[PDB]
Amino acid sequence: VKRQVASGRAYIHASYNNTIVTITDPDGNPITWSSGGVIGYKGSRKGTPYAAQLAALDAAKKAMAYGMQSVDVIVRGTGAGREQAIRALQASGLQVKSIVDDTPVPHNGCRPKKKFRKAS
Amino acid sequence: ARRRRAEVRQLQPDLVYGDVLVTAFINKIMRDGKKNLAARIFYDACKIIQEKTGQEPLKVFKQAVENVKPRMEVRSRRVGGANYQVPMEVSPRRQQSLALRWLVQAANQRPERRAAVRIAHELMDAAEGKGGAVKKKEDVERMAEANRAYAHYRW
Amino acid sequence: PSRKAKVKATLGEFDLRDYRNVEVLKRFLSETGKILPRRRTGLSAKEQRILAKTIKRARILGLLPFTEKLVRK
Amino acid sequence: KEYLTNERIRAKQVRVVGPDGKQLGIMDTREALRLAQEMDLDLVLVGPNADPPVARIMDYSKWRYEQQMAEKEARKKAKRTEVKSIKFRVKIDEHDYQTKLGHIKRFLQEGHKVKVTIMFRGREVAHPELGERILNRVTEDLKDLAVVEMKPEMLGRDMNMLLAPVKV
RNA sequence: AGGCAAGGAGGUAAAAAUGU
RNA sequence: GUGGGAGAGGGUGGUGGAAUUCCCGGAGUAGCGGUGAAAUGCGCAGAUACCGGGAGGAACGCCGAUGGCGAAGGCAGCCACCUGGUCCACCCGUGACGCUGAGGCGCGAAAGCGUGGGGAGCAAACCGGAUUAGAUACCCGGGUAGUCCACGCCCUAAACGAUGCGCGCUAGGUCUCUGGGUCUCCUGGGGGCCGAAGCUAACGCGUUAAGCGCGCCGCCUGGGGAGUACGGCCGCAAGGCUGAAACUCAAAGGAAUUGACGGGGGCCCGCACAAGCGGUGGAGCAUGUGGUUUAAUUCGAAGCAACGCGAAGAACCUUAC
Ligand SMILES: [Mg+2]
Ligand SMILES: [Mg+2]
Ligand SMILES: [Mg+2]
Ligand SMILES: [Mg+2]
Ligand SMILES: [Mg+2]
Ligand SMILES: [Mg+2]
Ligand SMILES: [Mg+2]
Ligand SMILES: [Mg+2]
Ligand SMILES: [Mg+2]
Ligand SMILES: [Mg+2]
Ligand SMILES: [Mg+2]
Ligand SMILES: [Mg+2]
Ligand SMILES: [Mg+2]
Ligand SMILES: [Mg+2]
Ligand SMILES: [Mg+2]
Ligand SMILES: [Mg+2]
Ligand SMILES: [Mg+2]
Ligand SMILES: [Mg+2]
Ligand SMILES: [Mg+2]
Ligand SMILES: [Mg+2]
Ligand SMILES: [Mg+2]
Ligand SMILES: [Mg+2]
Ligand SMILES: [Mg+2]
Ligand SMILES: [Mg+2]
Ligand SMILES: [Mg+2]
Ligand SMILES: [Mg+2]
Ligand SMILES: [Mg+2]
């Protein structure tokens, strides 16, 4: 059973390990999501730019198979695939209404793991 | 190698057709600096081509070459987790050279007894779109796409 | 090295000790909900400090945003 | 490994298998698809090598997951225990030797097979008399925890034994 | 538009005991 | 004193968002996570990614500075309250009341400890996974004490400006913060940077002197022994302060200089690698060497730069055995 909308939101979560693109309704109910490992790419490639792009494309395709047309790109996390993913989405024929950043930066919140200190 | 761009040799053009590509192919064929022997081989191949798929053998050869010219090849580059096969675009002259090399390899990989014959057959195959050199090219292309991830490691 | 405008001279004469005045304070944030640095606003140090405090107060009351979704990109 | 699912299947007539093992026989592919939809599942071509291809109505993703789990289990049951190596030397003092022995013991306990090479370097002629003696001593020390898998085999600038756990 | 930089990123940087 | 500031000064009472994490609701599915690669790890009992709500701790992004405050240790959301220092202007008051300060009392990061809570993240130890010769380590996945608060103790530190405090003097330029002014320029008080004289082993310091002086305090008297013992004191403990000598070496050490080096940085280069062709390794033989043999298999050559080398001619000679 499908629901259909023609409009919505493309949440791109770009980590350095992987890029995961969830495509979801204009409110934010997950329609179809794609990832690095989703499109076969398991390992380092998972969060490579090309992989991210591929994932984005896949997600777009899936959305299109729900009649989805006009998306709202929301980018979270800086990673290799955030720009590439965006580009892919743009290419897909999916009407990207706005590309909007939403990086979840703590307002000097609680302590990172040792790796993400040193730079403190 | 370090100092300059090191120019391409302007090969003294051919005699039978007047083509530099032809000369290049002859050179590729030739081992042990025996040009006449190889030139003769090439002309035999041409003759064979004329006989068989009854067309202008130079043109056929050119077509074959075109068929095997790659656009993408995987250069080996190390970026941490040992070496990575990294896909990049191939420059025109270089690409041509590569194609020629592949063609020659295919010719001297083929079953039949005599080289000239083999070369002719290889050329024909290339023109068609099938066989050794073309297969090699296809493989290389695949390698480029099956590693397209690493593309961003443009040299 | 960025030579366009400065939010000191851009704005008219105003009170940056006034935090009810917010259409005058949204002048000093980024496209993000971020207090613009000295080289952006072009105020004196003391003045800048005062402005920052005012902005913070506004945010607490809920008149200037604390953080924003960055458009276009 | 993987199959054609619902729309991926282009062959016209297919043999329909159920969620548990419901034999529906050779039906149309379209019909099978419809059935799958009704079930809120998918028909997946489980035997493309069979009489009008054998295709199971299943949750394909679930099946895939199961397969993956099985694979993981297989590779976790492949025994993480391997070879630990402990290069000794000719002139190895007592404390250090004991430390090395302790290490070896620990490895054995963990479950590991132990490459107990003696490094040589200089003269490498009087080597077996002293090196071999040392090896023998080591073996004696580990009489209870280690059965000698091997016997001292000189290749390079060295001689290697392997050791195995006494009881598994 | 290119210039030159200012600043944010993102990729590289990560693997080394044997003598006479 | 009067007037006025600046401030992350200190305490106390509040409170505001981001984030994390968790719970619950939804929608959705095959991975996510992680890395130089991986692997454990969690995931269809539905994770991740997404929105809605709640719970909760903890920290306070941007401003932010090379800034400010404090005697240091230190101190950053914002608000309010209590309160400390401090600076300036006025020269109005007192009239030497000053400076230092052995002891003493007070403060004193972090870790630690004790009792009571709290516990989100993180995270010693610890358990996993890798890496590796090994790995008690870096790298990852978890995870306790701890970190947070309350009260009590501990007192150390690279508690460093490695610069005790005060006051006077002795070029300037400069950026800065923060006052006062008849204010594109003066004058105070901080914080930096470059420099006169001077100093300094040099490095450097240089009106914030490491300069010239003066006052008072601390301390040093070669290195290691050793911040150790022993005593004493303090602490619930860990441990702190105090603090040797026997012995032992001819030094230990500072600053810089020339090199060499670097798994520092830049600029280069070479068949260096790469692009390419051909071989070596594999055969057999030719040769030279190691080794071993032998009466002797003369003697030399040793990574590159020894090994078809001295030998551009060992049957005898050569030949040295
Ligand atoms: Mg007053
Ligand atoms: Mg849920
Ligand atoms: Mg007076
Ligand atoms: Mg009087
Ligand atoms: Mg005292
Ligand atoms: Mg503490
Ligand atoms: Mg953790
Ligand atoms: Mg371990
Ligand atoms: Mg291990
Ligand atoms: Mg850890
Ligand atoms: Mg405690
Ligand atoms: Mg303390
Ligand atoms: Mg310091
Ligand atoms: Mg300090
Ligand atoms: Mg000191
Ligand atoms: Mg004092
Ligand atoms: Mg101060
Ligand atoms: Mg000054
Ligand atoms: Mg001078
Ligand atoms: Mg100076
Ligand atoms: Mg000055
Ligand atoms: Mg001095
Ligand atoms: Mg001590
Ligand atoms: Mg005592
Ligand atoms: Mg020195
Ligand atoms: Mg090469
Ligand atoms: Mg040589």
Author numbering:
A (entry chain K): 10 to 129
B (entry chain G): 2 to 156
C (entry chain R): 16 to 88
D (entry chain X): 3 to 170
Question: What text comes from the article?
Answer:
IF1 is a small protein that binds in the 30S A site. IF3 is a two-domain protein that plays a particularly important role in the fidelity of selection of tRNAfMet and correct start codon. Here, we present 11 structures of Thermus thermophilus 30S PIC at resolutions as high as 3.6 Å, representing distinct steps during initiation.
PICs 1A–1C contain IF1, IF3, and mRNA (but lack tRNA) and differ only in the conformation of the 30S head. In tRNA-free structures (PICs 1A–1C), the dumbbell-shaped density is seen for nearly all of IF3. The NTD binds near the 30S platform with a possible interaction with uS11; the bulk of the NTD is positioned away from 16S rRNA. The CTD density is observed at the top of h44 adjacent to the P site making interactions with both h44 (1494–1497), h24, and with G1517 of h45. The CTD in these complexes is positioned such that it would clash with the tRNA in reported structures of the 30S PIC (Simonetti et al., 2008, Julián et al., 2011). This P-site location of the CTD (henceforth termed as position 1) features several highly conserved interactions with IF1 as well as with mRNA in the P site. CTD at position 1 also occludes the binding site for H69 of large ribosomal subunit and hence would prevent premature subunit association. The A+1 is flipped toward the 30S body and makes an H-bond with Arg91 of CTD. Regardless of whether the mRNA purine is A+1 or G+3, these CTD-mRNA interactions suggest a role for IF3 in identifying and stabilizing a good candidate start codon in the P site, even before tRNA binding.
